[PDB]
Structure formats: structure tokens, C-alpha cells
Coordinates of C-alpha atoms and ligand atoms in Angstrom, one line a residue:
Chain R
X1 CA 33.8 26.2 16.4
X2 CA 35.6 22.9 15.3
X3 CA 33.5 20.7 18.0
X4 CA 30.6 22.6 17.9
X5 CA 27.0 21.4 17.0
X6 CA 23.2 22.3 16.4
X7 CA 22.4 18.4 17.9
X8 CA 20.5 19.4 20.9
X9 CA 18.5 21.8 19.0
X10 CA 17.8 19.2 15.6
X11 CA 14.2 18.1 16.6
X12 CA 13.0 21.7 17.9
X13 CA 14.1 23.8 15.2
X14 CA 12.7 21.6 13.3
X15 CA 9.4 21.8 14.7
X16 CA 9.6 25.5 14.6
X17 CA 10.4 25.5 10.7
X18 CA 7.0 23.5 9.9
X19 CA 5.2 25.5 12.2
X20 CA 6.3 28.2 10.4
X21 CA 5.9 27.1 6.9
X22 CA 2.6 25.9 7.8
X23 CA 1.4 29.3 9.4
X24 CA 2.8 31.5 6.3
X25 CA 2.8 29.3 3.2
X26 CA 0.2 27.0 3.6
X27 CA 0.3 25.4 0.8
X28 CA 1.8 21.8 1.0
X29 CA 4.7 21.2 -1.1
X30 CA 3.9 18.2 -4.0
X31 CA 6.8 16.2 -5.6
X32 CA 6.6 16.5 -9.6
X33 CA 5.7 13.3 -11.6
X34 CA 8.4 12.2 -13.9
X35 CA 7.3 9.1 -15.8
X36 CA 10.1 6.2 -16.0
X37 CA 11.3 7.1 -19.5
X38 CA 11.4 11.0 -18.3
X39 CA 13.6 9.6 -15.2
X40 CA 15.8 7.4 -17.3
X41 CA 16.7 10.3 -19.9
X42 CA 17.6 12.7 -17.3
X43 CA 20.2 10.4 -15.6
X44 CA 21.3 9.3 -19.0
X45 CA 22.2 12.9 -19.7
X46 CA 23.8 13.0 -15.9
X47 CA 26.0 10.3 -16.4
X48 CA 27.3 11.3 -20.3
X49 CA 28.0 14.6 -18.5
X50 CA 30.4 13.3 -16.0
X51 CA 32.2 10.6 -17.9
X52 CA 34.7 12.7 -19.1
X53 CA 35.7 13.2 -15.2
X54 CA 36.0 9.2 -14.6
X55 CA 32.7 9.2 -12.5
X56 CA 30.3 7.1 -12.3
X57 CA 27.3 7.8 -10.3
X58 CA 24.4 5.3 -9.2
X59 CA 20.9 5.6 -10.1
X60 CA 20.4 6.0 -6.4
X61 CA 22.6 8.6 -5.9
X62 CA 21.2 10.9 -9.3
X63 CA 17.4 10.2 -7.6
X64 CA 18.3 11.7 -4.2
X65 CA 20.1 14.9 -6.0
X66 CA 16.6 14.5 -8.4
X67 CA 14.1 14.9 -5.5
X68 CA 15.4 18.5 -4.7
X69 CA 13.8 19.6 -7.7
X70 CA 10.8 17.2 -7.8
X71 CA 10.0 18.4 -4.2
X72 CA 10.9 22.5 -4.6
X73 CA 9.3 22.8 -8.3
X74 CA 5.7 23.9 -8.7
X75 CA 3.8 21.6 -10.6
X76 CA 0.7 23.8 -11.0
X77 CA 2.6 25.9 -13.1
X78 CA 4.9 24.2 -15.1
X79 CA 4.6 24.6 -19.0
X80 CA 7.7 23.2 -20.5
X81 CA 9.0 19.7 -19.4
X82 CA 11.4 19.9 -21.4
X83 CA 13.1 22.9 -19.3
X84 CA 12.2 20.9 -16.2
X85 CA 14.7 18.1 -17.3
X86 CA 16.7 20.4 -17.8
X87 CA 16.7 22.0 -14.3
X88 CA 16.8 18.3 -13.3
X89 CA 20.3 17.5 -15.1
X90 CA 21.9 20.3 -14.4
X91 CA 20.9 20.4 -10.7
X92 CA 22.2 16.7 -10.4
X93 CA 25.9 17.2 -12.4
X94 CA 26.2 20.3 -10.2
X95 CA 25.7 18.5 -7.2
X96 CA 28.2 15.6 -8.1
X97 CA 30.9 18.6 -9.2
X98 CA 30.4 19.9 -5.7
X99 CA 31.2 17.0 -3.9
X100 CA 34.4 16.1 -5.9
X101 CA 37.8 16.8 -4.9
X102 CA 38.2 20.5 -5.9
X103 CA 42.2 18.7 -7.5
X104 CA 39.9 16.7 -10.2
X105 CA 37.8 20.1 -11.3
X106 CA 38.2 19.9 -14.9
X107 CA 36.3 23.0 -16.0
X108 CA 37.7 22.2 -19.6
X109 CA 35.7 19.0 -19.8
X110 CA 32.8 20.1 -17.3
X111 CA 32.1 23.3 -18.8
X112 CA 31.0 21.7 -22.4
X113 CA 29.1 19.0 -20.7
X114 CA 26.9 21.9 -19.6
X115 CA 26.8 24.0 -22.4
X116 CA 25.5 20.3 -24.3
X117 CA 22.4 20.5 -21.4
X118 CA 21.8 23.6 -22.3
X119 CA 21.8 23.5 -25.8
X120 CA 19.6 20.3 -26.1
X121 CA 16.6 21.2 -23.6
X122 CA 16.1 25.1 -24.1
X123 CA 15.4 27.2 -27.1
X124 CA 18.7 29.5 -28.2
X125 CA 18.0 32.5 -25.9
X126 CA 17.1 30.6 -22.7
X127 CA 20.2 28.1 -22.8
X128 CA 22.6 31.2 -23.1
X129 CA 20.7 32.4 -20.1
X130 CA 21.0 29.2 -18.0
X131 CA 24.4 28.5 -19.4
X132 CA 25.9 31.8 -18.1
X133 CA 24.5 30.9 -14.8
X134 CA 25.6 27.5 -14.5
X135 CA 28.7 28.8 -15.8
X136 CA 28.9 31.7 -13.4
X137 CA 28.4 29.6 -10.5
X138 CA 30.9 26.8 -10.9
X139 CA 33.4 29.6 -11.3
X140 CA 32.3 32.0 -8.2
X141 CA 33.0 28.3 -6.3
X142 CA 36.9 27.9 -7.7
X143 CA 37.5 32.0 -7.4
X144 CA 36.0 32.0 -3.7
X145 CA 38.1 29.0 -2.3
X146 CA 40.1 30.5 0.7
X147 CA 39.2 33.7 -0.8
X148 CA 39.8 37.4 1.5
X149 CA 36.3 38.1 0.4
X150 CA 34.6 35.0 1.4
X151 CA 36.1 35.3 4.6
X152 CA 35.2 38.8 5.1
X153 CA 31.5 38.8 3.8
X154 CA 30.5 35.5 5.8
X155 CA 31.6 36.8 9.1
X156 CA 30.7 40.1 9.2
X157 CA 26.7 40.2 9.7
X158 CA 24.4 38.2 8.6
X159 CA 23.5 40.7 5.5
X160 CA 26.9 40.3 4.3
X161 CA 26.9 36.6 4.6
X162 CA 23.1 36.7 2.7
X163 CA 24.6 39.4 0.0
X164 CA 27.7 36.4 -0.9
X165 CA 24.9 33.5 -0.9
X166 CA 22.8 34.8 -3.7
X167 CA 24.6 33.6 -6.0
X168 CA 27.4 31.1 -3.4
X169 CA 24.4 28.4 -2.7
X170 CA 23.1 28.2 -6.2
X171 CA 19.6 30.5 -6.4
X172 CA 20.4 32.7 -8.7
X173 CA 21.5 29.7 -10.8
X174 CA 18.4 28.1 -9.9
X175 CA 16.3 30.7 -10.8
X176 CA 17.9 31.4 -14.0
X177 CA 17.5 27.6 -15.7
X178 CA 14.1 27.2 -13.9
X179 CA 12.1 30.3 -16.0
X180 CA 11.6 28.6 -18.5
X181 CA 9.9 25.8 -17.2
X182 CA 7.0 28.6 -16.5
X183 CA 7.0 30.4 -19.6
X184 CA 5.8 33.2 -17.0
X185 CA 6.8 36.5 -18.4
X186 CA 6.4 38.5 -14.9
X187 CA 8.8 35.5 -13.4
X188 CA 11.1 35.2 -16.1
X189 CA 12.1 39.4 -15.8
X190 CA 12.0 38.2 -11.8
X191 CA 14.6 35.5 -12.7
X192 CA 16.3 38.0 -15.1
X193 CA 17.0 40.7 -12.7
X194 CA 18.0 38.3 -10.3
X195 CA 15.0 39.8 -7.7
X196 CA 13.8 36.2 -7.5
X197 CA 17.3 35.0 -6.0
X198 CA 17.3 37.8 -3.6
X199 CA 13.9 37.0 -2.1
X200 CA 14.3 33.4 -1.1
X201 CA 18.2 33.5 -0.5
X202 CA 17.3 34.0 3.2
X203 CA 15.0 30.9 3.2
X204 CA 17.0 28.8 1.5
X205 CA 20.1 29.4 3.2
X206 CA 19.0 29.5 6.6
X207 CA 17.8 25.6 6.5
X208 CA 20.8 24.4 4.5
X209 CA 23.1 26.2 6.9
X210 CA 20.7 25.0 10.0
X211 CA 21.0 21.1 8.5
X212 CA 24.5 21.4 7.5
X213 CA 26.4 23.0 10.2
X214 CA 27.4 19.8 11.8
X215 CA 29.1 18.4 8.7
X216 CA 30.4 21.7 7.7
X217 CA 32.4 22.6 10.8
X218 CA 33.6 19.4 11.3
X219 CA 35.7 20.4 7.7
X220 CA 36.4 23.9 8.7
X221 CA 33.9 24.9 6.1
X222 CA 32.5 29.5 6.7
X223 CA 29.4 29.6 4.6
X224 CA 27.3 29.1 7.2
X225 CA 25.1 31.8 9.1
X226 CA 25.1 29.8 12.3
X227 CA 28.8 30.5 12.6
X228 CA 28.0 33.9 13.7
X229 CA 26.4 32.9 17.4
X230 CA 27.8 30.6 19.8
X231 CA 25.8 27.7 19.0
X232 CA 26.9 26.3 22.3
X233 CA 25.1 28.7 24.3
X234 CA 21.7 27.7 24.2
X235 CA 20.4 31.3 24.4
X236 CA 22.7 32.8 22.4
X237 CA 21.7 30.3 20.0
X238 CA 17.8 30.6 20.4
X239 CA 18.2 34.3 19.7
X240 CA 20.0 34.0 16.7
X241 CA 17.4 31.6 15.7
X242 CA 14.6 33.3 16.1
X243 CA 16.0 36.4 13.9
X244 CA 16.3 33.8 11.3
X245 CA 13.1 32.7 11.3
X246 CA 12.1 36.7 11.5
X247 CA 14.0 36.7 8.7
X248 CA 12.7 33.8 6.7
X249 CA 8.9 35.4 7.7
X250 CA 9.3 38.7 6.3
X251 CA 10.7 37.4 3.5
X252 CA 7.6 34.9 2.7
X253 CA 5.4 38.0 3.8
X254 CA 7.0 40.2 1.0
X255 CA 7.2 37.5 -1.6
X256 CA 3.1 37.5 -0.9
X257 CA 3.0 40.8 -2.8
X258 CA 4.4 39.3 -6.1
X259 CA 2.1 38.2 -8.5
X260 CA 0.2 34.7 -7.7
X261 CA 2.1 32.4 -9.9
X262 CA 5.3 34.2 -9.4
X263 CA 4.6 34.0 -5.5
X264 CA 3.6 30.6 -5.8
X265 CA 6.7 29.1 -7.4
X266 CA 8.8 31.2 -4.8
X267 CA 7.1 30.0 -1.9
X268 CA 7.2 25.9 -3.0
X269 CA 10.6 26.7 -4.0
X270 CA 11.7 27.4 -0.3
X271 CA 9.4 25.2 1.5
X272 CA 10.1 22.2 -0.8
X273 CA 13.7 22.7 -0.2
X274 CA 12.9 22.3 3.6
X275 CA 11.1 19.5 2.5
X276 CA 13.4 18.0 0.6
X277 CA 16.5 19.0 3.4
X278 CA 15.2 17.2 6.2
X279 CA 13.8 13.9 4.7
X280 CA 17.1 12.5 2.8
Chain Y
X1 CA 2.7 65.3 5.0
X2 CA 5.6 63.3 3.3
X3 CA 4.6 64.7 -0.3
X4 CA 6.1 68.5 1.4
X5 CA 8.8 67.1 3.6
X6 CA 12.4 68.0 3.0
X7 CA 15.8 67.3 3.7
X8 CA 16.9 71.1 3.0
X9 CA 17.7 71.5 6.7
X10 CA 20.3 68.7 6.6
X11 CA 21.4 69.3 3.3
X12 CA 25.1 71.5 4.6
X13 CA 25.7 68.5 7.5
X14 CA 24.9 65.7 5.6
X15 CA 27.2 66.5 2.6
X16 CA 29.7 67.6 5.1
X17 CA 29.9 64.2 6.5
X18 CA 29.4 62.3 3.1
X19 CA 32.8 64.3 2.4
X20 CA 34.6 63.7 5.8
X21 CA 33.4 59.8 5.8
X22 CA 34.8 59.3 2.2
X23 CA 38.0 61.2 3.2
X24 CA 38.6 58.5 6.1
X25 CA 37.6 55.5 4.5
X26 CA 38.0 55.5 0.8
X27 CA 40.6 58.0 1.3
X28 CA 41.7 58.5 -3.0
X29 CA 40.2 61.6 -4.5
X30 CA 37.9 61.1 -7.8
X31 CA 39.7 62.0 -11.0
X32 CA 38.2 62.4 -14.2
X33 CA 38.5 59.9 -16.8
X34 CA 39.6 62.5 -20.2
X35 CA 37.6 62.1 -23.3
X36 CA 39.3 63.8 -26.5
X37 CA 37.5 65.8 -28.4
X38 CA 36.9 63.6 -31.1
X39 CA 35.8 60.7 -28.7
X40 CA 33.1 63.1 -27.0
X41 CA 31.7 64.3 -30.3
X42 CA 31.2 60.2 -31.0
X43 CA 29.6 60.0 -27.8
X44 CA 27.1 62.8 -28.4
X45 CA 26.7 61.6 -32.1
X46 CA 25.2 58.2 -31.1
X47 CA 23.2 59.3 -28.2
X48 CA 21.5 62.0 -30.0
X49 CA 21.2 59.1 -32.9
X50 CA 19.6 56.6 -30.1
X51 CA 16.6 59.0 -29.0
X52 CA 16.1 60.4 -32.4
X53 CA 13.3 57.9 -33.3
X54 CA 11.4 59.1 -30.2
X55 CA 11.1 62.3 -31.3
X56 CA 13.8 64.0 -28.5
X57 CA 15.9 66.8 -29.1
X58 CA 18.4 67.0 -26.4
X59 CA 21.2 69.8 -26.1
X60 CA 24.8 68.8 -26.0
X61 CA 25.2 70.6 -22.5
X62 CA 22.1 67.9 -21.1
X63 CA 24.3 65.1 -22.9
X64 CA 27.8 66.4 -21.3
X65 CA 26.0 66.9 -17.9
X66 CA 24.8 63.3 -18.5
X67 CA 28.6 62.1 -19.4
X68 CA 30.2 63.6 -16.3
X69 CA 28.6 60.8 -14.3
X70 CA 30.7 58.1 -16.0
X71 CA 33.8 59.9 -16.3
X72 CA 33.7 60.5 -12.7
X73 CA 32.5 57.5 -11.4
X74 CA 35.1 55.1 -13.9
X75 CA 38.5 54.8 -12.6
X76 CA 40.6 56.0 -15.1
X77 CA 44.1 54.4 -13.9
X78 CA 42.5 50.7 -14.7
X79 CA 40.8 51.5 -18.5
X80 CA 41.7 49.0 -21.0
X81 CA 39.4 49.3 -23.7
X82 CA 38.1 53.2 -24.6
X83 CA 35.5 51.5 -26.9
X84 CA 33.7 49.7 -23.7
X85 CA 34.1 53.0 -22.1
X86 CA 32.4 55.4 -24.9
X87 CA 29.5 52.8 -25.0
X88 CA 28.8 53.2 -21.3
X89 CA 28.9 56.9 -22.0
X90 CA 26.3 56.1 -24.3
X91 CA 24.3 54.0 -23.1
X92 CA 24.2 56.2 -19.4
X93 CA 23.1 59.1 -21.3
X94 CA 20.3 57.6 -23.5
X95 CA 19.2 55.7 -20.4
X96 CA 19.0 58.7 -18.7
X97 CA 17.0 60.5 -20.9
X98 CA 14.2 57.6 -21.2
X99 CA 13.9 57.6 -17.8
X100 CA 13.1 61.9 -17.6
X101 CA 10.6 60.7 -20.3
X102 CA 7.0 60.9 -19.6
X103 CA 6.6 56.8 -19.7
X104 CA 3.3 57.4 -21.8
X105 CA 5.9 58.4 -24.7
X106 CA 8.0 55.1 -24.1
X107 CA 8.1 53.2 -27.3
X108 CA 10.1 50.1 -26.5
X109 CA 10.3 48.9 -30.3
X110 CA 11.6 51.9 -30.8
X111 CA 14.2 51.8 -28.1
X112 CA 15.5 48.2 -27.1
X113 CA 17.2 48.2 -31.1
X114 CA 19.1 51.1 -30.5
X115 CA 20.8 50.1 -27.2
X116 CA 20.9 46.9 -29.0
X117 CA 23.1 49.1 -32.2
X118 CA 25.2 51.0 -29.3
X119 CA 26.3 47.4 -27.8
X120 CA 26.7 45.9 -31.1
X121 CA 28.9 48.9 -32.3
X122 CA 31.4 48.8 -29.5
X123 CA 31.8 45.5 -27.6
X124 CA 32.6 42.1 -29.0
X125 CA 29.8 39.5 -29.3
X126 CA 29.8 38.0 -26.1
X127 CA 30.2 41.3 -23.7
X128 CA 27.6 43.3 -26.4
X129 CA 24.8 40.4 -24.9
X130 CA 25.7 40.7 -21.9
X131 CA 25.5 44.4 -21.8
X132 CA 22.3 44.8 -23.9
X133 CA 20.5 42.1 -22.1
X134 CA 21.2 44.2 -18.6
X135 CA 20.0 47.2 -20.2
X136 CA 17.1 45.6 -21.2
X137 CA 16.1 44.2 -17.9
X138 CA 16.4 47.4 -16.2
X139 CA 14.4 49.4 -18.6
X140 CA 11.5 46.5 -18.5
X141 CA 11.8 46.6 -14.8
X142 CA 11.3 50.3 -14.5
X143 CA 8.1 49.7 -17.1
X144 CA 6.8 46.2 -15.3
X145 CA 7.0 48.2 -11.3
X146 CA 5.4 51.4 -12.0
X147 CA 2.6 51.2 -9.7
X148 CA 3.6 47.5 -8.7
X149 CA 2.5 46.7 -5.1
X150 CA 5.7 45.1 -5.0
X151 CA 7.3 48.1 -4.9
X152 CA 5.1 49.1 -2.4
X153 CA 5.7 46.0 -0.5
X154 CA 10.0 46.3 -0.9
X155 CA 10.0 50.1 -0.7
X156 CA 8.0 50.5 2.9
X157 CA 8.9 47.1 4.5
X158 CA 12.9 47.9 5.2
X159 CA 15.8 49.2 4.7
X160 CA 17.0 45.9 3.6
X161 CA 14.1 45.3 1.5
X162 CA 14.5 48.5 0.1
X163 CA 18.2 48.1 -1.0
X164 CA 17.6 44.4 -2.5
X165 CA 14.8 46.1 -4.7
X166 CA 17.3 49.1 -5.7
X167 CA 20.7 46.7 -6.8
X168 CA 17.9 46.7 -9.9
X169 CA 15.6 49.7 -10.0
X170 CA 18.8 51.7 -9.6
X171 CA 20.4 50.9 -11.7
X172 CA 23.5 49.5 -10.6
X173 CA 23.8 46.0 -11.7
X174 CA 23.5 47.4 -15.4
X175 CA 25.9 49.6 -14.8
X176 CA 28.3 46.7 -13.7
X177 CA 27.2 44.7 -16.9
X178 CA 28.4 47.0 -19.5
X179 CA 31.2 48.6 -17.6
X180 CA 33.2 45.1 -16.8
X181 CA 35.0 45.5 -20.6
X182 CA 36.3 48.6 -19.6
X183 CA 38.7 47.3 -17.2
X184 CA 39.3 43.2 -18.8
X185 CA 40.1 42.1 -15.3
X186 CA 39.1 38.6 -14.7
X187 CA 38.2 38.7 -11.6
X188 CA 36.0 42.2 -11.9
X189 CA 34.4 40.6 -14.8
X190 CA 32.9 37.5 -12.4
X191 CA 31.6 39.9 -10.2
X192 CA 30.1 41.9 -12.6
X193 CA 28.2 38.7 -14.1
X194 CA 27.5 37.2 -10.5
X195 CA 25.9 40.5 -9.7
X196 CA 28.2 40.7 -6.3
X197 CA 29.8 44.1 -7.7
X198 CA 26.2 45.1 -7.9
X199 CA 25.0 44.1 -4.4
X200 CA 28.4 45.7 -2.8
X201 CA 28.0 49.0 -4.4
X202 CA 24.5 49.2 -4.3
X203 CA 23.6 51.1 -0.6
X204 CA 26.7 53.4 -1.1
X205 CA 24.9 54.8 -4.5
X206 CA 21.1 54.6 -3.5
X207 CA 22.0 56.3 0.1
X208 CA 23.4 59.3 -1.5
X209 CA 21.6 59.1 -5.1
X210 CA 18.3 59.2 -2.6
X211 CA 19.6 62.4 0.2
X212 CA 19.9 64.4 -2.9
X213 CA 16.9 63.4 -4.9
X214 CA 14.5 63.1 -1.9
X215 CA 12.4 66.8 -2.1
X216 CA 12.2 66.1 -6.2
X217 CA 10.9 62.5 -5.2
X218 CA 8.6 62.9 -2.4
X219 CA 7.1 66.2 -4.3
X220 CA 5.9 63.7 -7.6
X221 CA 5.0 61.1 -5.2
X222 CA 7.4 58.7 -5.9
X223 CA 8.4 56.0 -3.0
X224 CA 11.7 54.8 -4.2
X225 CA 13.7 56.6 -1.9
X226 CA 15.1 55.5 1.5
X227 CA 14.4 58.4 3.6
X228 CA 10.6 58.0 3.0
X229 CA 11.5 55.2 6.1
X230 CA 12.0 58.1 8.5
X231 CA 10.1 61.2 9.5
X232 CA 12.9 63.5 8.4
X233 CA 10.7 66.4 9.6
X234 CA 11.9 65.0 13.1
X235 CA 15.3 65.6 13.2
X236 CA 16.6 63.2 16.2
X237 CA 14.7 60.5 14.0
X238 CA 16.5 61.6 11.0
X239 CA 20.0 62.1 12.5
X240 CA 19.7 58.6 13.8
X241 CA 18.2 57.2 10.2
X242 CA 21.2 58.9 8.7
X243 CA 23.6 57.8 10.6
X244 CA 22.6 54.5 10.1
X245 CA 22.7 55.0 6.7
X246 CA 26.2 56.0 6.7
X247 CA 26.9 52.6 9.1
X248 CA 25.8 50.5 6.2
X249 CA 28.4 52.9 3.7
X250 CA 31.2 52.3 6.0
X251 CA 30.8 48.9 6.3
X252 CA 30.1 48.1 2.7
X253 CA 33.2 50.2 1.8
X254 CA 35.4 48.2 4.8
X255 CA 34.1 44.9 3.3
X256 CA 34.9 46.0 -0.2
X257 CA 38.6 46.8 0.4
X258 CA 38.4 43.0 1.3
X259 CA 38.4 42.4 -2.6
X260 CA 41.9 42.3 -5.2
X261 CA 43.2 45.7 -5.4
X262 CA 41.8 46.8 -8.8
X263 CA 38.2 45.7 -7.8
X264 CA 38.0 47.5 -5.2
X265 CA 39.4 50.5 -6.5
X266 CA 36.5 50.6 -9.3
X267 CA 34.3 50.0 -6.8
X268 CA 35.1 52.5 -4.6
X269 CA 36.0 55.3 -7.3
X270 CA 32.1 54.2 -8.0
X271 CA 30.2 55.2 -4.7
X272 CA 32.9 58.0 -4.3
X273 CA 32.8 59.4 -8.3
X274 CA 28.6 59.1 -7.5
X275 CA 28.8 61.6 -4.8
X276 CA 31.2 64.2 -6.2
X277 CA 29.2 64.0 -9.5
X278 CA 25.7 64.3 -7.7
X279 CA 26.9 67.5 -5.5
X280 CA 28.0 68.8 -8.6
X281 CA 25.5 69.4 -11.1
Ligands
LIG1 NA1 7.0 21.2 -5.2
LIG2 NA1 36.8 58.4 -11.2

């Protein structure tokens, strides 16, 4: 699985994604507007949060992290900007702590940083909400490295691998700070319950894995759902793919149920991250 | 028609091989976690004091019934904190009762303070939040699905979209949220608040909790049960919906000894406490 790769199936499967997405969702994903001094307090906040670990981080770098919520956000909806920074911060210093060396993971002077997001953008309720997430998932990460568990939930089936990546690629966490930038009291119990993370897991995971399973088995990295085929074997492979996308449709299909701003947000929420995947 | 089907010719075989699968695979018998007395009296003191601004009378033998779930389903070689445990006593019992409630009679201002007193009373300040806000969510989630199409949509869809809806409408992922201080094991506690002890335990509870519920269910109409998916009045269809049920058990239970040794002992004195404690009363 070391020299494997999805290469010859890039261009296709991403064909069949839009195809998809435009077939079930309809709806075009739009990037949010943040106006210049919007933009420049966000990564002000992203940079004072990762000073205390020595990093400095380019404008460039904070505004590619950015687009992921610009693109997956619903801007029909949104009621408090002041949450949506929030997201917007948080998402970004995230980001950066993933891609450190685990060896420099100060959770001492990381944690704090967060709590200070938290505690400046929401209202007293909502910050403890979205700082026990944030707080939950940086931790999940340390326990979970070259855990038994991982191991055996990620190579079992795919419902065992889906089960670990509620809360292992960040949705739960996602959906918990994002509430209140709705002020949507059916989607905040959604959020609350974690119901929202579990219906757009599949969706989101799927893509990231399909886009990141060169990179990550190149550094002997398991959280990915296309290690369970032989991606070498082209219809072994096109098999497995097509019960994703299954997957990913009867997802969307259920999510059409919810309530119409509810379903709105989850549905830009999964096709803006495909969005957002593929073109950076 | 479903609203007269039953399970009542499966009922001997099916808890025959509940029994034998939990003998092979989880292998340690239930025990009883022991309440004094003087620490059951306290229990049925502030339950009876919880419901007493609905107007409910309930009878210490409905309270005690109530109880048994917990003190089966805890794993009493891991307790660390007896206070954690009486309010999950409590708060199992009172929850119980408001849901045999006609909803008509549920008065949330009433309600939401007193779980709010029982998790102020007998966790410290962080864990007492993170316990009340679970109860909370679940009892608002019962109120905001009654008659929900997405309950409909979760419920009839499949198995897995049934079970994703249930790690709530359960129950389970409360249950995880207030009984973490129990144990004060660091990892446990994470996978409480990640919801992950939730979603592990969840088809080994709802798989049982619905074989035994199923003709009360199906006769009130309700559609939160599993084996509403099969035509149990068939029984090669049922036999091969069951034992697919008890595929997902095993393999949650093989995953779950995957986990550090005390975790995975709660969790499996959990889906193994459930059964003995459902064929029981
Ligand atoms: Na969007
Ligand atoms: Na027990």
C-alpha cells in the first residue's frame, strides 16, 4: 500500500463527484464575502494564537486554510459574523497544529490560545460548547497516534472506519463552533446531539480520503477509506468507488428530510468541501 | 399488518443465542454494583423529589426496578466516585419516568432545573455541565422528533441510518456523559466526550433494547425499532435480519476489546448488564 496510488483514476472520479453533486444537491456552492478589515482580524487572531509555538504563518498560507470555510459555509443563512470568524480562526490554527511536528505539540500553550477564540467571538454558553469541541479534537489526535483502536476501527469496514471519523476529521468540531453562526435552533440541537456530524461524515471523508490518499500513503498514514480495496486493481477499485458514492447519495437523500435551512447548510457544507478540495 | 406483528415466536431462540453469543465473546458475567441502604434511600429521595413538580407519584418498587438497569449495566470493579454513580441512578430513573409520560404532560420548565439540581448536587462543576447539557439534548431530542419526518427518513432508510439516529434517541451518548465520573479514567472520559463510547455501544444496546420492546412498539405505532426493517412474520427473513443483527454485536464487541482494558470492560459490562437487566424485569 506504500507505492500505491488513485493517479489514474484523479480526473474520473472527479467527474463523477460533480456529476453527482450536481444531480443531488443542485445548489452551487458560493464563497462567503469577508471584507478586508474582516480578513485582516481573523489572521491577526491566527497568528497571536500560534506565537507562543515559534510559528509564523503567511497571509497566503492562513487564506488557503480560510477558503475551506468561505467555500463550505452557507451564506444564505448566516446571522452572526461574529461566530463566522470564529469558525474562520479556529479552522485556520487547527490546520497549522495539524501539520506541525506532533514533538512541538504544546497543548499547554495551544489549548489557551483557543479558549481566548472562544471567549472573544461567542457569548458564554456557545464558547464552552465550541471550546469543548476544539478541545476534544486536538486531544482524540494525540490519544489516537499509533493507537490499537485506530488501527482496528479503520481497517475493519468501512462503518468502523466512518464511526472513528466523526469526530477523527474534524465534523463534529465543525459542527459544534459553526451553530452559532445560524442562530438556527433546529440546527443548533442537530449540532448538539452530534446528528449533524454523523450525516455528512460520509461525504466529507470520502473526498478528503479520495484527494489525500496519495500523500497519505506515501507516510504510512491509516485513516483513509480507500485503504480498504486494492486501489491497484482497477475493478476492485471502481467497485469500492461506486459504494462510496452510494454512500455519499443516500446520505444527501436523507439529509433532504431535515428541515430546509438545516438541510441547506449540510448540503453546502459537503459540496463546498469538495469544492474547496479539489481547487487548492 | 406491522401494528399486530410479533416477535413472540422467536422470543425462546433469540434470547438463547443473545446468551450463548455473550458467553463466547464477552465471556465475564454481569455483577451487580451494591447500593447500601442509606445510598438507595438517597437515590429514591431525589428522584421522587425530581418528578414531584409534575405532579407523579411513583412507587419505590417502579424506582428500584428503574435502578437495577444502572447497577447492572456499571462495572462495579472500576467505580471511583459513588457520588457520580448515585446521580446516574438518578438521573436513569427520572429520565425514565418522563419518557412513560404522556408528552402532553411534559413541562420542560418544570423539568430541565431539576436534572439541572441532581447534576449540580453530585458532580463537580465541569463534569455537572457536561452531564446536564447531555440530558438536556436528549430529552429536547425526544420532544423536537416526535412526528419528525426525519425520523421517518433515518428509521426506514437502514440499518445504518437507523443506528446513527439511535446513538441519540437511545439514549446512549447521555448515558456515557454522566457516567464517565464514575470511573475518572482519562482515557474513558475522552470517549465519553468524543461521543466514540457512544457510537461503539450503541447497536449492541438498541439490538436487544428493540427484540424485547418490539410487540409494545409496533402495537402504539411507534417506528423506532430495528425489526420494523424486516417482515418478522416471515421467519427465513427474520432469522437472516437477526443474525445480521447479532453480526454487527460481534463485531462491535471484537472492535471494542481493541480499546485499554478498563474501557472496554465498561463498555462491555454495558451491552452485557443491558441484556441481563432487560430479560429480567
Ligand atoms: Na458555501
Ligand atoms: Na455490571
Amino acid at each position: 500500500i506504500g507505492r500505491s496510488s488513485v493517479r489514474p483514476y484523479l480526473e474520473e472520479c472527479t467527474r463523477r463527484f460533480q456529476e453527482m453533486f450536481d444531480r443531488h444537491v443542485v445548489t452551487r456552492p458560493t464563497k462567503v464575502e469577508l471584507t478586508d478589515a474582516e480578513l485582516r482580524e481573523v489572521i491577526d487572531d491566527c497568528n497571536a494564537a500560534v506565537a507562543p509555538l515559534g510559528k509564523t504563518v503567511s497571509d497566503e498560507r492562513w487564506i488557503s486554510y480560510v477558503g475551506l470555510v468561505l467555500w463550505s459555509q452557507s451564506p444564505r443563512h448566516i446571522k452572526d459574523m461574529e461566530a463566522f470568524k470564529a469558525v474562520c480562526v479556529l479552522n485556520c490554527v487547527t490546520f497549522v497544529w495539524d501539520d506541525m511536528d506532533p514533538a512541538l505539540h504544546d497543548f499547554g500553550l495551544f489549548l489557551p490560545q483557543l479558549r481566548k477564540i472562544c471567549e472573544k467571538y461567542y457569548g458564554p454558553e456557545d464558547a464552552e460548547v465550541a471550546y469543548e469541541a476544539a478541545r476534544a479534537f486536538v486531544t482524540s489526535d494525540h490519544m489516537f497516534r499509533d493507537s490499537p483502536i485506530k488501527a482496528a476501527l479503520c481497517t475493519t469496514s468501512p462503518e468502523q472506519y466512518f464511526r472513528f471519523r466523526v469526530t477523527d476529521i474534524g465534523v463534529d468540531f465543525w459542527m459544534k463552533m459553526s451553530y452559532p453562526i445560524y442562530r438556527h435552533p433546529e440546527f443548533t440541537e442537530h449540532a448538539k446531539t452530534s446528528l449533524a456530524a454523523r450525516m455528512t461524515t460520509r461525504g466529507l471523508t470520502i473526498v478528503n480520503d479520495f484527494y489525500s490518499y496519495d500523500r497519505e500513503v506515501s507516510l504510512g498514514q491509516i485513516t483513509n477509506c480507500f485503504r480498504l480495496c486494492d486501489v491497484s486493481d482497477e475493478t476492485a477499485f471502481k467497485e469500492f468507488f461506486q459504494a462510496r458514492l452510494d454512500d455519499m447519495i443516500e446520505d444527501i437523500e436523507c439529509i433532504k428530510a431535515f428541515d430546509q435551512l438545516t438541510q441547506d447548510v449540510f448540503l453546502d457544507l459537503i459540496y463546498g468541501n469538495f469544492v474547496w478540495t479539489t481547487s487548492n
